[PDB]
From a paper:
Nuclear hormone receptors are cytoplasm-based transcription factors that bind a ligand, translate to the nucleus and initiate gene transcription in complex with a co-activator such as TIF2 ([name]). For structural studies the co-activator is usually mimicked by a peptide of circa 13 residues, which for the largest part forms an α-helix when bound to the receptor. HPLC analysis of the crystals revealed the absence of the receptor and indicated that only the co-activator peptide was present.
A beautiful but unanticipated structure was obtained that forms superhelices with left-handed twist throughout the crystal, stabilized by ligand interactions. Placement of the 13 TIF2 helices into closest proximity revealed their arrangement as a superhelix of outer diameter 42 × 46 Å. The helices are not arranged parallel to each other but are organized in pairs which point their C-termini towards each other and the N-termini are located on the surface of the superhelix. The strong left-handed twist in TIF2 therefore comes as an exception, being the only all α-helical motif that assembles into such a superhelix. In contrast, when crystallized alone the TIF2 peptide forms an α-helix over its entire length less the C-terminal aspartyl amide, but including the N-terminal acetyl group. The conformation of TIF2 that is present in the superhelix would clash with residues from GR, explaining why the helix of the co-activator peptide must be shorter when bound to the receptor. In addition, non-proteinaceous electron density identified a molecule that is wedged between two adjacent TIF2 helices and that mediates contact between them by means of hydrogen bonds and van der Waals interactions. From the SHELXE density alone it was clear that the ligand is a steroid, which was unanticipated but is easily explained by the buffer component CHAPS, an amide of cholic acid. Cholic acid is a convex molecule that fits into a concave surface patch lined by the methylene groups of Glu1, the side chains of Ala4 and Leu5, and the aromatic face of the Tyr8 side chain. A hydroxyl group of the steroid binds to the carbonyl group of the Asn3 carboxamide, and the carboxylate of cholic acid engages in a (possibly charged) hydrogen bond with the guanidinium group of Arg7.
Residue numbers in the entry:
A (entry chain K), B (entry chain J), C (entry chain M), D (entry chain L), E (entry chain H), F (entry chain I), ...: 1 to 13
The structure:
């Protein structure tokens, strides 16, 4: 779940 | 480390 | 609705 | 989980 | 220098 | 790990 | 000019 | 035209 | 260092 | 056909 | 500069 | 066979 | 232009 959230947040970067 | 990166990214939120 | 609020809050991040 | 994440983000609010 | 590049890239997240 | 994060972020670049 | 090219390449990142 | 060729070549960068 | 970063980013171009 | 050949030749670049 | 960058990118091509 | 010879000749292109 | 770019790309070939 942490990777999923990170994936969402880093999408743009 | 993931929590640390998340804490940085969520800081403004 | 929880997703809708999360999406707004995570906006800046 | 969604509630747990919301509780964190809403903590300053 | 790595932190500076990371900072730049993470700016929108 | 800094290189690992960078490698991920630079991947579509 | 190097910064200008870098800015272009990194803008997706 | 040079910019158009550059954009094509840089598109995966 | 700018050249080093450019070389990496341009390597598949 | 010229674009097809160009794509082939460029698609290392 | 555009030719120099193009020569670099087309180097493999 | 023509494609095979072409692939070889175009390999450095 | 397409012939000129092709001649350049093929000149090793
Ligand atoms: C979640 C994301 C993409 C995963 C994928 O979909 O393939 C991956 C790519 C690079 C990863 C990061 C890098 O591996 C560097 C760090 C390694 C540590 O073990 C965790 C935090 C750490 C900062 C990682 C967080 C997360 O797992 C990342 C950001
Ligand atoms: C990293 C952050 C703050 C931790 C701290 O400052 O001590 C904590 C507080 C709320 C946490 C999240 C919430 O507990 C809900 C999720 C629980 C899952 O087990 C991991 C992802 C999950 C999405 C967590 C990611 C991260 O651990 C968070 C974001
Ligand atoms: C709401 C947001 C964006 C949805 C979208 O716009 O498509 C999505 C993207 C990543 C999601 C999170 C990630 O999937 C990781 C967690 C997964 C759990 O099932 C719920 C909490 C959890 C922390 C999710 C909460 C929310 O659904 C998120 C934050
Ligand atoms: C998670 C937080 C605190 C829970 C607690 O610790 O008591 C609770 C208090 C108010 C809640 C919100 C409010 O009840 C209003 C909405 C009600 C909907 O059923 C879900 C989203 C909704 C937006 C809720 C999301 C979340 O469950 C909240 C934000
Ligand atoms: C560069 C950035 C901001 C530093 C600041 O200006 O305060 C900092 C804040 C969160 C940091 C990350 C977190 O500390 C978690 C990881 C810790 C490892 O030691 C390196 C990678 C790692 C993924 C870090 C990379 C980088 O230094 C980050 C992204
Ligand atoms: C991590 C990435 C890929 C390395 C690899 O192929 O595994 C490498 C390629 C070029 C590197 C960068 C360049 O060498 C230029 C900078 C050199 C400094 O010493 C660190 C930051 C600096 C910005 C480097 C960060 C990172 O190590 C990079 C981005
Ligand atoms: C060009 C870009 C954005 C500048 C801007 O938009 O204002 C800036 C932001 C982060 C910079 C990088 C970081 O400062 C880390 C490195 C610092 C070294 O002095 C040069 C290479 C180096 C890798 C820098 C190259 C470039 O100037 C970057 C990539
Ligand atoms: C063609 C490309 C994308 C333009 C766009 O559509 O935004 C642009 C973005 C950055 C540009 C480069 C940078 O501006 C730095 C140089 C500026 C000089 O005046 C020309 C060559 C030069 C090396 C440029 C070549 C080309 O115009 C580039 C690569
Ligand atoms: C770093 C890379 C490879 C250098 C090498 O290893 O020989 C070189 C090849 C061609 C170079 C570019 C071309 O010379 C065109 C531009 C010349 C300007 O003075 C700097 C930016 C400029 C856009 C250069 C950036 C960088 O130095 C490049 C991209
Ligand atoms: C064939 C290739 C990729 C087309 C595609 O699938 O997107 C395209 C992308 C950029 C194109 C070039 C650019 O548009 C610049 C030139 C435009 C002229 O009208 C034809 C020659 C010209 C030099 C083009 C040749 C060819 O059509 C190119 C090289
Ligand atoms: C830079 C490179 C080599 C020049 C040299 O050998 O030193 C030259 C050879 C063929 C050139 C291309 C061909 O002349 C066809 C195009 C002509 C247009 O006027 C500019 C873009 C255009 C797509 C040119 C871009 C660049 O000047 C090229 C790619
Ligand atoms: C043989 C080579 C690669 C095929 C492959 O993917 O393995 C292919 C890629 C581009 C092809 C060429 C392009 O499709 C353009 C021309 C199309 C005509 O139908 C045949 C000659 C023609 C000049 C082709 C000859 C040959 O089949 C090429 C050169
Ligand atoms: C430009 C180059 C050299 C022309 C010359 O200066 O002699 C010529 C030699 C063979 C030509 C190719 C061959 O005639 C086969 C193809 C014929 C199609 O009508 C155009 C694309 C086609 C793939 C041609 C593209 C280009 O005009 C080529 C590659």
């Amino acid at each position: 779940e942490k990777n999923a959230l990170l994936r969402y947040l880093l999408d743009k970067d």
